[PDB]
Structures are given as structure tokens and as C-alpha cells.
Design a protein around this ligand. Sequence first.
Ligand SMILES: OC[C@@H]1O[C@H](O)[C@H](O)[C@H]1O
Ligand SMILES: OC[C@@H]1O[C@H](O)[C@H](O)[C@H]1O
Ligand SMILES: [Ca+2]
Ligand SMILES: [Ca+2]
Lengths: 504, 504
Amino acid sequence: MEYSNPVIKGFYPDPSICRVGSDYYLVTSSFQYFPGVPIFHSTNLINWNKIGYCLIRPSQLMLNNATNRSGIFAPTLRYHEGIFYLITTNVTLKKNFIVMSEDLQGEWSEPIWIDGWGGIDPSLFFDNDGKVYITGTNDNARGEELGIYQAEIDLKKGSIIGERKLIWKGTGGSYPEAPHLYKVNGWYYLLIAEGGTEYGHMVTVARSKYPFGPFESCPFNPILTHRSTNHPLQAIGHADIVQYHDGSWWAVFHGTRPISYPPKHHLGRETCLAPIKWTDDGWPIIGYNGRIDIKMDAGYLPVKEIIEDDFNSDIFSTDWNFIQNPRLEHYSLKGRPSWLKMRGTEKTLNDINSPTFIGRRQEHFVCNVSTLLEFKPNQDNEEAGLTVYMNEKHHYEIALTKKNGRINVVLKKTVGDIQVVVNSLEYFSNTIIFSIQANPEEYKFSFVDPNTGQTYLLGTGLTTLLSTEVAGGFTGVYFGLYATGNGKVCTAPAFFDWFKYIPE
Amino acid sequence: MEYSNPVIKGFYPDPSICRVGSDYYLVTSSFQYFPGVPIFHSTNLINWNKIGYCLIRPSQLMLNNATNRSGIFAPTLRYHEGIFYLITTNVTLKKNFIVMSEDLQGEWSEPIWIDGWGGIDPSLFFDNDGKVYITGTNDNARGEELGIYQAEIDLKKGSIIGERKLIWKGTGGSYPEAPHLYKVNGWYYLLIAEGGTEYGHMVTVARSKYPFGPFESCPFNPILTHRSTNHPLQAIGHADIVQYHDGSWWAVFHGTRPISYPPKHHLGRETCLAPIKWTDDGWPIIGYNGRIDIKMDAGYLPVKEIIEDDFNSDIFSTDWNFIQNPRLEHYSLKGRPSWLKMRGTEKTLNDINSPTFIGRRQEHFVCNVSTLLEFKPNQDNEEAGLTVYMNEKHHYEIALTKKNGRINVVLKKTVGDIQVVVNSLEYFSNTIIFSIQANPEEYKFSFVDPNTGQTYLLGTGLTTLLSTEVAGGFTGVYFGLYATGNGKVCTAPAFFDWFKYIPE
Ligand SMILES: OC[C@@H]1O[C@H](O)[C@H](O)[C@H]1O
Ligand SMILES: OC[C@@H]1O[C@H](O)[C@H](O)[C@H]1O
Ligand SMILES: [Ca+2]
Ligand SMILES: [Ca+2]
């Protein structure tokens, strides 16, 4: 039997996995998006269902001034004696913290702040003797030596027990990071990422008889990389190991699907899966001797997408994210039952701090995304529409606005410093359907006059100008509904009747 | 003593070096630019003076349909018994050929076509017994196995002697290429590039007692790479080895100076230098154990930029290139003595085939480039100016044109599919000075009214949107003078009085 990589498509980086009985739970990084840290469930490691998010309250997730270069970085999920622990970094605060839960269907605790523990990629390991270890990277604010650091931790107080020690510098790649400590057959293994989360990404491993080392580098490191290859999956690493309940071993990790030349990616880093075998001399090998594929053999794993939101519910679906903490008064599912009402502010898609926007990830190269908007702008600055958004300097949008006292539908783009109105047509109806067809190379922007059903191709836009390589940061493209008054509060409300996401 | 890398700054890739006595000659790839294959001279390996180009006649250099993804790929320069040989690929023709010279101050021969020898990166080696070997890559048109191929060659007839054989597949990196065969102390060494000429680039080496092998991989391959590092020099490889006349060994090779995150480069691949030491077990080591730097120790090498063209000469300087073969009638240094006259055609900077343009490489991050233009356009399509140009979809320009019967100075940009007029101002004089200040992040576009000396900042543009990563191809940014009629022949002539390039 076979599965396909990625196993979780779209913007789902830095996967960390946790087994409880015969069920599996998995978390990814979310940066400036709210709610933060999606969490998934699976019984077979291949098929994942999103259960929700871990960070859903402003007290858990302070995103003021966060951008797609900051906010929430890699999270690690662990379980001990009925309690789940989620440990991560808010890079905008430069703070590491834990939240806890005894029930993933409920909400998580308030943060337990780890005072004095810097760096990124914090991880926890519950040792068989009852000791608990925190492992992480060098602290850039203290200007520490590059490498992996560790201490015993008291999980109640959020405080270190004894001393913080350097345990490994890695093999010599850049940015030794993503550390996870495991104990298997009488050896401690330290699994890390090196080379940076771009084309030099690799996974390396070390071992010792003791939790703090000294650690010996695996003689065939790196144990997983696509560096110096032209494989369709690139930038592979940030692995976390799990033992399936049939006894076999697996890793989850992220990778990209770049297109064009030089390679460029716009769906973010996506969660992948590969098997592990243990050598006779006691080292793990991932995949086909350090390389993986799009199509994989499933071993003994038991093998087994149209999304339509009409906004009838008064709870938002788990697809939707906001840019930083939502200003809650500017969204309503109750003010006009069966529509989403949005109040645009002075802030635009060019601004980082709390623009009126709700969005969901592009999870497929080929897809058609649409919405129906009612909007009658009162002034020329006023605008509402549908956006393809990477970050504040990289986004395309089709929208209704007003220019010299006439209503127009527009295609607008922000690419770096370029802000351009690509096309403009006069429009005469109170509602409009926007419709975007995505393929690997371009987005086609159309609008429909709803009562006639007539469709009009307004323009197109390249995917590669929204790619992470061009745009910066650590994220993937979102499809978003938004409103703005372009420097003033938008006096007209925007109402969205529904949103459809139809992958090929 | 110390030198700085790169030793040849700006767009100078795939360097191949050749010693004759106590002097050194070096060539680089040029793609769609004409004249093709620049050639440099040095006495110390650090300081290079451009002597001219190797391919200066249409019969040598057929560039119709060539773009910055095609045209002339890596060249190799060799010397035997008073005769220099230059061997390279015209990828647009898919043909490999040699040109010869007995005097580098003169012109080279007509091409000797190597019938049936495909692939890229052809190289020559003159063995101590008098045999001559051609070495190259797999032929994509025949769909051959990835690797390095070799035959004995008859240099008169341009024909293979005996059989073409696969001699090495490399260590397992992508795109094994840039092969050079050497014989040193009784061993043949095969030096190659792997991993692709981007962030996975590396140099690897193999050896044998026989010219066709079997070849044994160096046990510490790769012998030069910056893959999986954050060093300011990236994408290092395509090396060629030389023995200096004091007995010490050196390699030239290319690398990039990327900026931003993810890393992006706009000065092209630039020629670098590093020392070689030979191990006791008979393997070469480049640099500081496989890594190099911006600042290097010069060993015993004997250690030691404002460019102003007023167009008074009737020969073009060696700074200037055209996009493909120039249409010679559309440029004149004699029609108006002391100016360059240019006749714009229907073709624009958006078109690949022979737009009216003359340009020179950006060789410094920080520089000020200027020109003085006389231009009085007769119709609204007519345009002449100064361009910052990467390729047909990636260029910025400040120009004089006409709109609804008025003369305007404009800042225009083409970025992917986006074509935008960023700013426009009415202009009232027959001449204008355009002036561009470059720094690592942006270009600032100004104009000067010459008789008043008043200066006006028209706009700015990001460097990263012209980067190779964004734009495609294998080249660096040029500063260019151009004219066009935007779909029609330009009825007005354009005259440029001078051009200044002032690095910081
Ligand atoms: O994804 C953000 C950061 O990049 C690296 O993957 C690191 O492990 C993580 O925290
Ligand atoms: O620069 C063009 C091609 O890329 C690689 O550097 C190869 O060696 C060369 O022919
Ligand atoms: Ca509805
Ligand atoms: Ca002059």
C-alpha cells in the first residue's frame, strides 16, 4: 500500500507528534495567525483531521506587532500521565511558555512562562525514571554559542532545576535547532535540524548513554536531506519521531513543493511522513537511506475536500484565521443572520497591525475559491473583497470600491514596493461574486453579476511573486475576505454570504 | 597579505583559467549578451584586467531567440604549443564548438563545430603523452544517464577519436557538470560540480591511474561547498585549478553575494579564488577545509574603478554588451560625432529578440550610474532612457516619452506580469540627465534639468524584485541605454552624450 507526501497539505510547518494509546496528535507553527497552533488527530499517521487550535485566547497569544517573520515559531506536543503539554516560543515577545490540557476537545490552560529560558524550538522529554528535561536552542538575546541546550525542568513552577548546559553543537551546519531528546533501547538520541529551513535543510542525529552527553554524531549524518538534489520536495527537516502501536517507527517533518527556476514555493512548508529503520549498530535511518518521495510505501499502516461555509453558524469554522488578534467588534455572524458582517478600519492589507481580514490556507496548487459580497461603499477610499495574501507586501485582491463617485470592481496588487490597480470596471449591482481559479503558475480573477450569472475575467497574477522566496517570512498563501477604508474607517459595512473552496 | 573575494565582481560565472608562462588568462559565460565570453588577464591571480571578448562576430555567436536562460553557457580556455582553445556550448543552437587563437590581442577563428558531442560544460585536456581529451556532461537531447562523458578528440577536424564513455556519475548530487581532467604527480583528477549552481552547489573530485578510469571518489567529498551554511558567499562551485609559477596551487570558481531572507542575489555569480593544498594521501583540499571567505590569505601571491564614457571614440568600449546580436544600423558613433545615436524599433525591453539597448554589468552593490540624453519624441509610443535590467520580465527604467501630446519623464517597471508606470512628470527641455543611486536594497531614480542643474527624485525600486531568484535565468543586473517605439518603429532618434559608472 502507498500514501502521498505531504500528508498535511499547505501551510503546516515544524510538525510535532504525540501518541496516546492507539491515537496520534500533531501540532504546527502559525506565526502571526490567530488562532494559533493547529492540532490534528490521526489513527494511521497518514490521514489527519483538524481538531482545532491550542492558542485561542488573547492571554495565550499576544500578537501585537507580529508579522509572517515572527509570532509563534515551532511547537512541541507531549503527554504524561493524562496531561498534554504544548511548549513553544512567541518570538515577538521573545518568551517561551507551556500550556496544558487534560482534554483536547476542551481549551488549554493559561501560559506557564519559562522565565530565563530563551532560544526557539523548546521541547520536552519525560524520562523513564520520572525526570523531565527541557531542550532548546541558543539564546540570541544573550548572544550564546550556536547549539542545543538542556536542563531539568519543574513543570508546575515553569522553572529550571539545576543548570542549563550545552549538549551538542550539531555536525557543523548552520542553525542547529528543532531538538528532540528520546530514549530507545538504552540509548538517548538527540535529533535536530541543521542548515536552515530552506534548501540546505537537513536532519542529523547524535547519541549518548546519558541525557546530557557527551553526544556522539551519527557517522552517516545527515540522516535526512534533499540538499543538492532536484527532487520535487525540498527543504526537508524539523523531524519528530513516533513509534506506531504495531511497533514500527516513523518520523514526521516538513518540506516544500517549489515550482519554477530558481525554485520558489507558495503553499508553505507542508507536513510529510517517512518510515524509520534502526541499524544493527543502533542508529536510525529515515526513508530510502536519507531521501524520501511524494509516493511512499505505507508499511503496515492501515490506509484509507470540497469546503463550503454559508456563515449560518455563529461559531467560526476551524478553517478561519485572522491577522494577529481579531478586533472582535469588527466581525459579526449575528448582526445580519446568515452573513458575515465585516467593518473595515483605516488599516489595509499593506499594514501589519490588525487589518480587518479573515482567511484560510491555500492547500492545493489547483483550486477555485469564491465568495459573495454585498457592499455599497459611501466614499472613494472604501473597499471590500477577496484577497490572495502572503504578507503585507505581497498580496493580490479583487474588490468593490468607489472612484470619483462611481462603483468599480478592481484587481489590485501589492508586490514589494509596487502598489498597482491592474484593471478597473464599473459595476452596477449591490452584490457580486468573486471567483479565483488557481493553478501552479497563476491566479485568474473573475467576477459574476449574481442575478444574471454573467462572468467577467478581470485579470491574472503570478504565483511566484507571492512565493516565500520573494516575500519573506515563514508562511504560505491564504485566501481572505477583507474590508478597509484606506486610511479612514470604512463607513459602509461589508457582508459576505458564503465562501467556497473547491480543490481539483 | 590578503585579498578579497570575489576577485572579479559582478556577472562573471563559470570561470576557466589558463596559465601561459608567468601570465594568466580567464573566461566566463555570457548567455544572451553580445559580444560573448569575456576574457581577462592577470599576473597574480587576484587582479584581473578585461582584455576583450572571444566571440565578436555573428558567425561565432548566433543569439537569435536567446534569453538569460540560454545562449552561451560555461566556456573552457586551454593552451597548447602557441595555440589557445576556447570550447563552449551555444545552448540555443544546442551545439558545442571550439574557436582558436595564436594571439589574444587579435580575434579568434571561426567556430570548429564538434558534430555529435552534446551536453554542456565541454572541456579540453592536453595529456603529457600528446593525446587530447574532450570531457563534458550528459546529452539531454539523447536522454542519457546523468554524468561525465569523455573521448579522445582530433582538434583539426572537430571530430571524436574512438568512443564516447561515461567516466563518472559523481557522488550523487544533482547535475554532475563542469568537468575538468588534470594529471598531477602520476594521478588523473576529475574535478566536477554537483548539486546545481544554486544553494546546493558543491565541488567534488575523483582520481584514477588512467584517463578513462575507473574513478575513485575522494573520501572527504565535497571538497568545496557552502551548502547548509549562512555564509555571505553562497552557491560556490564550477572550479578550475591552476598552478602558479611559484609552484603553489589555486582554484577559481564562482559564488553569489545574496541579501535579504530568503537569500536573493542581483549581481550574478562572481568569480572567486582560493588556495589548494595536497594531502599526503594525494587529494586536493580547497580553502579552509572546504570553506572559503570574503577575506583570504594571499599566500605568496604578489598583491597590489570610476568609468566614464563620453562616446568620442568610434569603437565601443569593452564594458558594453547588446541583447543578442546588435542590429548594427540602429547604433552609430559617427552620425553625430561625440554622441551615441540610437534608433528604437517596435521591440521593447519586454521583448527578447533584438531590442535597441546597450548595457554594462552592475559590479558593485553601491554605485551611481548616469547618462545624458537628447530626445524629442514625435508620437506617444516613443521612449528612450536608462534601464536597470535583469531580463525581459524584470527591469526598471527612467525615460523621456510623450503622453497625449506632452513630453513626460517616467519611471516604469516590469516585474513578472506587472507592467506599471510608477510616476510621471511633465518635462520641458531637449536634454535630460538620468541618475540612479544603487544600494543593496534599492535603486533611487532621479533626473536633472541640465542647464539649471536642478535634480528631482522620481521614485525608487527594490533590488530583490530583479534578483535571479525572482526573475529566472543565470545572469546579473545590467545598466542600459535604450530606445523603443512600443510596437512601432521610433521615428525620433535618441542621442546619448555620455555614461558615468561611479562605484562607492
Ligand atoms: O518555522 C520557524 C522556524 O524555522 C525552523 O524550522 C525552526 O525550527 C522554526 O522555529
Ligand atoms: O552557468 C550556466 C550553467 O550553470 C552551471 O554553472 C553549469 O556548469 C553552466 O554551464
Ligand atoms: Ca449565508
Ligand atoms: Ca559625448
